[PDB]
Amino acid sequence: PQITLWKRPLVTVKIGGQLKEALLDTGADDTVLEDINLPGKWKPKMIGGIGGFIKVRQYDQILIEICGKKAIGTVLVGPTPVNIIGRSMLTQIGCTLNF
Amino acid sequence: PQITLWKRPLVTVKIGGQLKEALLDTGADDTVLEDINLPGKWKPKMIGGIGGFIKVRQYDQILIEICGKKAIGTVLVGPTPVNIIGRSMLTQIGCTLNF
Numbered sequence A, B: 001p002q003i004t005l006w007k008r009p010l011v012t013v014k015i016g017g018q019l020k021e022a023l024l025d026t027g028a029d030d031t032v033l034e035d036i037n038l039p040g041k042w043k044p045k046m047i048g049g050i051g052g053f054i055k056v057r058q059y060d061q062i063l064i065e066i067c068g069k070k071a072i073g074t075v076l077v078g079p080t081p082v083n084i085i086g087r088s089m090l091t092q093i094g095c096t097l098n099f
C-alpha cells in the first residue's frame, strides 16, 4: 500500500482480539492506544505531546496486526485523544515516507 | 527521496529567511512551529494533542521550503515542544506513506 495524505492515514489494527482504528503517525516515537485492555504486567510511564503530558501504562512485546501485517513491540495505553501507531511499529511493517 | 523511520524524520525547512528543523508528521493535520516569528496578521486558534491544548497564532498563505521543495499554506505558531510539518503541507510536496 502506498497512501497519500489528503485525509488522515487511518488503518485498522487488530490487537488482543480487538479491532481498532489508529493513525499511522511518523511524528510519534511510540504506539499509543486509548480504548483497549491488554492483560498482564506493565510499567508506568509519562509521554509528552503538544499540550503537555499523559500518564500511560507501558506494555511490552505486544502483538499488533496493522492493515494485515504483524508487528511486536511496545504499546502504551493511556488517555490519548486518538489511537496512534508510532515509529517503533511503523519500522516493523516496512513503512516509509516518500517525496 | 524515500525516508525510513528508524530515526525521527527531521528535515530542514526555510521559512521567512529562517532555517529550522521540523518533523515530517503524518499524524499532524497542520504545521506548527515554535522558534519563529512571522510578520503580519494572524488569527487565534487552539489545537489539541496528547496532553491537551495549546494556544497558537494561525498565519495563512505562508511560504515554506521543506527539503528544498516549496509549499504555501497555513502555519501555526505556538508552544509546541517540537516543530512539525503537518498534512496540509505534506500533500504539497507530494509526500506519501508506503508499505
Ligand SMILES: CC(C)CN(C[C@@H](O)[C@H](Cc1ccccc1)NC(=O)O[C@H]1CO[C@H]2OCC[C@H]21)S(=O)(=O)c1ccc(N)cc1
Binding pocket: A025, A026, A027, A028, A029, A030, A031, A032, A047, A048, A049, A050, A081, A082, A084, A086, B023, B025, B026, B027, B028, B029, B030, B031, B032, B047, B048, B049, B050, B082, B084, B086
Ligand atoms: C507532536 C509530536 C512530536 C508527537 N505527537 C505525535 C503527533 O503526530 C500528534 C498525534 C495526535 C493526533 C491527534 C490527536 C492527538 C495527537 N499530532 C499532533 O499533535 O497534531 C496536532 C497538530 O495538528 C493537529 O492535528 C492533529 C492533532 C493536532 S504525540 O501525539 O504527542 C506523541 C508523542 C509521543 C508518542 N509516543 C506518541 C505520540
